[PDB]
Amino acid sequence: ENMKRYMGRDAQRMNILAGRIIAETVRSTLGPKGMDKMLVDDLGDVVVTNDGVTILREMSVEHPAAKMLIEVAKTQEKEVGDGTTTAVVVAGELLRKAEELLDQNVHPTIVVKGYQAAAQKAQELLKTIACEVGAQDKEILTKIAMTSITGKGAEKAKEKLAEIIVEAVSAVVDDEGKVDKDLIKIEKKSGASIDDTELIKGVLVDKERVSAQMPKKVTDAKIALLNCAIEIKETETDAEIRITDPAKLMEFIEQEEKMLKDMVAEIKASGANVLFCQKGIDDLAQHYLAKEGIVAARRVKKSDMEKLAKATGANVITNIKDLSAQDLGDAGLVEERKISGDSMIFVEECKHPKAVTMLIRGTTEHVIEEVARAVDDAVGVVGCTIEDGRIVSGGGSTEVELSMKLREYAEGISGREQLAVRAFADALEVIPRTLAENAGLDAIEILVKVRAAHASNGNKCAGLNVFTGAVEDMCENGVVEPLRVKTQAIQSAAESTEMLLRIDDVIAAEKLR
Amino acid sequence: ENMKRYMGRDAQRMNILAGRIIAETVRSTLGPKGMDKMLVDDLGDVVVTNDGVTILREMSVEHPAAKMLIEVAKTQEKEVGDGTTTAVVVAGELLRKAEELLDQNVHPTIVVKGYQAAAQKAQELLKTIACEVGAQDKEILTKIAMTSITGKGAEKAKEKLAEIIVEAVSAVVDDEGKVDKDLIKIEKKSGASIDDTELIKGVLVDKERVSAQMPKKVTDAKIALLNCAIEIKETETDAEIRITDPAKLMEFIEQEEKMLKDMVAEIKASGANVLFCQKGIDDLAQHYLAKEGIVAARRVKKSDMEKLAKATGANVITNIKDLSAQDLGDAGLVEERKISGDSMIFVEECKHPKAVTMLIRGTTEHVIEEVARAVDDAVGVVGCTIEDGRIVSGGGSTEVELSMKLREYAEGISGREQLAVRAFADALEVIPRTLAENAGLDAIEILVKVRAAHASNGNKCAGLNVFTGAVEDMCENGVVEPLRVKTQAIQSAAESTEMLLRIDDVIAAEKLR
Amino acid sequence: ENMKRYMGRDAQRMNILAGRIIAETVRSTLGPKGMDKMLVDDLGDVVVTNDGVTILREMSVEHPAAKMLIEVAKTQEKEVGDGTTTAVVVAGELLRKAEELLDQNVHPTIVVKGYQAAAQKAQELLKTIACEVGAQDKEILTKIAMTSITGKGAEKAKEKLAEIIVEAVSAVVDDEGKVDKDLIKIEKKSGASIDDTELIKGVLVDKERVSAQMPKKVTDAKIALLNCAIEIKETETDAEIRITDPAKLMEFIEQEEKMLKDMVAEIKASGANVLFCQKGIDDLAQHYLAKEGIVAARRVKKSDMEKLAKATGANVITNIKDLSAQDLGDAGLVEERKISGDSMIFVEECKHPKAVTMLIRGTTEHVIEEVARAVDDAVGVVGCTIEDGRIVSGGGSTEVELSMKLREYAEGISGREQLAVRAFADALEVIPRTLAENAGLDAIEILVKVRAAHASNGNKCAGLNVFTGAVEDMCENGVVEPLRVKTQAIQSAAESTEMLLRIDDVIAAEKLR
Ligand SMILES: Nc1ncnc2c1ncn2[C@@H]1O[C@H](COP(=O)(O)OP(=O)(O)O)[C@@H](O)[C@H]1O
Ligand SMILES: Nc1ncnc2c1ncn2[C@@H]1O[C@H](COP(=O)(O)OP(=O)(O)O)[C@@H](O)[C@H]1O
Ligand SMILES: Nc1ncnc2c1ncn2[C@@H]1O[C@H](COP(=O)(O)OP(=O)(O)O)[C@@H](O)[C@H]1O
Ligand SMILES: [K+]
Numbered sequence A, B, C: 001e002n003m004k005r006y007m008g009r010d011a012q013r014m015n016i017l018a019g020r021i022i023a024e025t026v027r028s029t030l031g032p033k034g035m036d037k038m039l040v041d042d043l044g045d046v047v048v049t050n051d052g053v054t055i056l057r058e059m060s061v062e063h064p065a066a067k068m069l070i071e072v073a074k075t076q077e078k079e080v081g082d083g084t085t086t087a088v089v090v091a092g093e094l095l096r097k098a099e100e101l102l103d104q105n106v107h108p109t110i111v112v113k114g115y116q117a118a119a120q121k122a123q124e125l126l127k128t129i130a131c132e133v134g135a136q137d138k139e140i141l142t143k144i145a146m147t148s149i150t151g152k153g154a155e156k157a158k159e160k161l162a163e164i165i166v167e168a169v170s171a172v173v174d175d176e177g178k179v180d181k182d183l184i185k186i187e188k189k190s191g192a193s194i195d196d197t198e199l200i201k202g203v204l205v206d207k208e209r210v211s212a213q214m215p216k217k218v219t220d221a222k223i224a225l226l227n228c229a230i231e232i233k234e235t236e237t238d239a240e241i242r243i244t245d246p247a248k249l250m251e252f253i254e255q256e257e258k259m260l261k262d263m264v265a266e267i268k269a270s271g272a273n274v275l276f277c278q279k280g281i282d283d284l285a286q287h288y289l290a291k292e293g294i295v296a297a298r299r300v301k302k303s304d305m306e307k308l309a310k311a312t313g314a315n316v317i318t319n320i321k322d323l324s325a326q327d328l329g330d331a332g333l334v335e336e337r338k339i340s341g342d343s344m345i346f347v348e349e350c351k352h353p354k355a356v357t358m359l360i361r362g363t364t365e366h367v368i369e370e371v372a373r374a375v376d377d378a379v380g381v382v383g384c385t386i387e388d389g390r391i392v393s394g395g396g397s398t399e400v401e402l403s404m405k406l407r408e409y410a411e412g413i414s415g416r417e418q419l420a421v422r423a424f425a426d427a428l429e430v431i432p433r434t435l436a437e438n439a440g441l442d443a444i445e446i447l448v449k450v451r452a453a454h455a456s457n458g459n460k461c462a463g464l465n466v467f468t469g470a471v472e473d474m475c476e477n478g479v480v481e482p483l484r485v486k487t488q489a490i491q492s493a494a495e496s497t498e499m500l501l502r503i504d505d506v507i508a509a510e511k512l513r
């Protein structure tokens, strides 16, 4: 270009263009025929993925409005877990549709007040076009999980990953019927092939036992968890022993030895035969533990302590004098193993696991760093279905329905907000358009057939099959999504587009915060 | 912005944007409420105008596609004379409409083949919606001239400039019924006010008479024009006179004096009493001319010689021996005057003037450098009406008619060129839109009323009154234009938009030409 | 200030401010109590003056709009001669009044269309409030001349300069009743005091006679003027004399001597005794001229030849063979003198002088370079009165009348141009305001009394006396001006303000012209 062209567009055109750029970046990642992006560091680190929020999070992005569009992905990441590409593409299409009305000289506030009236209507419509399913229905959960894994390169294992994830999530559904994601532990150990991934009803700990005389395999373990260290106590008032009789050198030392001997006696009297310590164990304590045949690990991290207490039913104890048979957990099998070159301790056959571990395998680290994402997304959508019990039809069959039902809305509205309501309704069809664009299909010929299927039936479901290249019922096909993925997406995108429509100036700030 | 955004748009988006910038530059100059631009040099020269092709000609413009849009104005300048802003605004609106179809993934060749089918249809329609008027009809010529001067700051004198220009142009209509613009001489002498502009049925010459004894006023002049110089001839073979007798110094010198004396005798015997020489006159020749009472000017420029020969009916003579009463022109009054600080020779009351001079007055040089443009445009449109005898209704009442009649066309066409035909028909309404935008009117409310006036009548004429802010018959109002202004505009704009639509790459050249 | 404030004003505010600056520069030079400016070069040259157009012409001025305001002074300089400060002050007050309406969001075209309607009304009013006087009336001419000299530092001699200038101008009134300024020669010879300035009914020539034997004083001179040089003619065909007999060396040389002897014989036979040559005279020709007692000067410049021919009635001759008693001028006294250190030839007591010389004296070159300006302005206003025969009352009594009579106009006009008409009428009172501001008077208290004097009488004349500090009849006081000074001023200022009101953009140009 040239210097003398900075004059030729408003600040709103500036911002709308800076925004459209971000949506144009991620759009080709969408749908089953989507493609991956390669991210490269200054230092030479490399990432390969088609996860949208990850691309938007790792990109070098410098314009303020583009920075404002990245926050549209993160909220979908945080509150739902899947859907971080639909949100940004719809947001940018809303920006670009708004650009088509400002060049006809429509006031920005009129556009904003129209979009506002359209989004609440889309909430009503989404709340009434959905299908209602029970949370105990594991089959549709499998189908939704598979729908989450499709298009991500790790497709070849989806019909196994689905079962694994459905059980994994069904375990951690709490006594109030809610899914917490951090109660599932995801571990990434290389070697073997992606189909060697498996589910552990228990924990994998990044530790090896302290003393090698300690039995390496235990059955029907009695597991004790400690937050206190097995070491000689100090006085928080400062001390000196002052040895005036030579005969009292060995006596002082023997009494320190006995103060550890009694701790080990007490650990034994509880009934334990496996031990975890969140803190240090002395090398003489280790001796008495290996002399009593108790298996012990030390300096275990707090999150692993939480997951052990969850899995076994043990209680973390802060003082050994209170430890009793009431505080001990149970687990059918404990064994140390060597896997992928690392020594690790395995806990298996737990009495009633409230936490579970998923072990992802793979021939390469760049493979596993993607399979982990493909599993996190499925945990998301499964939790959504279990919590809300409402599902919607996939393959963009929802956006066509919404566009039609908002156009039937727009004739009731009069004035000039009607223009913005129509531009909003016409911006949601970017998704089935792009779903055909990526597969190399003819989008303009496809979209008409898709619309026609709806207009003659009230068919909630009909949409594009990107393989046969034909228009099919997406519920009979088994392409299903949870309702929370649409509402959140539209909600985020509308609320973030209105801010860029309400701005008219850009000025400089003096060390803001 | 930022470096890492160069990737995000195609070469076609590049070119379309670089083009839209130019049309956005000149658009606010359009219509009666249009505003002027100030142009500033590197050296400090200044120009103030709202003439479009002048803005586009003097601008520092560096991108190739913007350079390609400037050629849309120059052709309208060259072939018609007026209309250089409608062309560029319509061109950029065509670019921007084309941009709305490429983001739906329509092939560029499909767009080009649609535009092509639309422009020929617009030619048919323009050839059939026009009004047919005779070239002798001076009243409508006045009305068209006034329409050409409206909106240019020099509005206060338009009802005098119209009469002046109509007579000036009617003089130079040749025996084959065609108007040549260079047969009208436009002169720019400061002082007095714009209303002191006047028309001379003759010539103003940038000369003063050679010898001050020569009469300064002559009535019923007999004017002689020479291409040869009145000087002593040289031999194109080289010469020496070789004086061997002292008594032959004065004799050689006297014979050179006689060789000028006889030329002046011969000029007198033709019957002349006023002289113009395209070349030198010797200081002794000047003596004999002032002794015979013949008025003479020397080194007159060739174009002034042409205009004198045209105005008086004299014949430019290359050799004085052939000069006769057959070669002399006639003019009722010749006088030298001092005007605006310059000495000039005035020729008036010509026997049958085939050329005329217009003397533009004004209080400032920046004023006159604009009044000259405002008169050149009216000479243009008057010539167009005199040559073609076809007129069209103004105030954008033509573009609405064309848009409607192309939409009635577009339902006959099937396939995907129909989309491009509609986008073409919807791009011509940029003109009545901008005509309301500049006057501070509400364009979206105005345009509907304007359309309605047409749809119920076949009213060719109805359009915006930018003063009352209301929709009126633009023929009863007297706002008229020549047909050649529309056809050429659309023709140029379509042909120049198709080139930017057919390009897909930009590469570097090795000293092209 | 700071970088981040360039945003905060429009291009029109830019231009209006850049314009107001120029009017603020020159405003304190206005009126009898006005003060002078000092101008300093890069090289060290110095000028001291309060002439406005000179300040505006010599200033380093770089912004385009300020460059556009300088053209308001030059036209008043060129077409009238006096009034170059009223024009610019009124122009800037019009700019600043326009600024007060744009901050209420009035459209620029509305302002321009109001100013236009006001200025034509001011022309009508000025054409009807003036007083009609005959051109033979030398008394009012004296009074106007004195009014032109007041306030310029050279006040002490005004009652002599007035008589000198009135006679000087009355001489050069041509047979058609028009005054040409270049027919008066202004000469600037230092020494003595400003009161030693005098008028010559003839010419002062920057020459001394060629041969010192030539009489230095001649009475009832017979003056011959030549455009040809008194030298041996050459052949424009090239020559060689070829001397084959030694006896023919002196013969060739004697014949060249005789060819000059005969020219001098012929000059004598015409009857001449004083000679001027616009070209060379040979050193032997000088001998024969000093032998015949004829006084001769050579290489006289063309303008001096014109003024001699005008003053004496002689005819400039191009060839000596035609010179006769018909071609000789007459003058009662010719003498060479030494004055101010320069030798000069004086021509006096001319038979019927159509040209006159004014000899300005003074103790310093910076004094005379100002007295010349103070005399040029009076020649201007005297010519204006002699040509038009219409006068107006001074001391700002005209601007108050115009403001009142335009306010009585503004109630007939309806719409929003009424606002601009009022702002125009209220902008003309800047002149009587500044006339009080410079004298250190209280302008707000003065202006009301001045208005009241008009409102109760139709008194055309009442205005400020800047000495007594009181309101008086300016015709009984003898402060009179020619009508052409007001009309031109208002006309220039309105036409130049409308251009800056019609602009809305500033862009860069590519070597304009
Ligand atoms: N078999 C299929 N045919 C067509 N579309 C599908 C199919 N399976 C999934 N999809 C669609 O792919 C989209 C998911 O793409 P994805 O890359 O996950 O985007 P996001 O990250 O925003 O969820 C959903 O809109 C879904 O309807
Ligand atoms: N009284 C009027 N009301 C509305 N439009 C007018 C009027 N007079 C002229 N026009 C319009 O102004 C336009 C001319 O604008 P102009 O600045 O000359 O553009 P161009 O240089 O392209 O001809 C024409 O389209 C004409 O119809
Ligand atoms: N005795 C006086 N009292 C008040 N005003 C006067 C008097 N004599 C002249 N003037 C005013 O001085 C003004 C001339 O000022 P001047 O510096 O010549 O400005 P300009 O160069 O624009 O003519 C005139 O408006 C005239 O009316
Ligand atoms: K994907």
Ligand SMILES: [K+]
Residues within 6 Å of the ligand: B029, B030, B031, B032, B034, B050, B150, B151, B152
């Ligand atoms: K215009």
Ligand SMILES: [K+]
Residues within 6 Å of the ligand: C029, C030, C031, C032, C034, C050, C150, C151, C152
């Ligand atoms: K002064």
Ligand SMILES: [Mg+2]
Residues within 6 Å of the ligand: A082, A083, A084, A085, A377
């Ligand atoms: Mg997804």
Ligand SMILES: [Mg+2]
Residues within 6 Å of the ligand: B082, B083, B084, B085, B377
């Ligand atoms: Mg035009």
Ligand SMILES: [Mg+2]
Residues within 6 Å of the ligand: C082, C083, C084, C085, C377
């Ligand atoms: Mg003055």
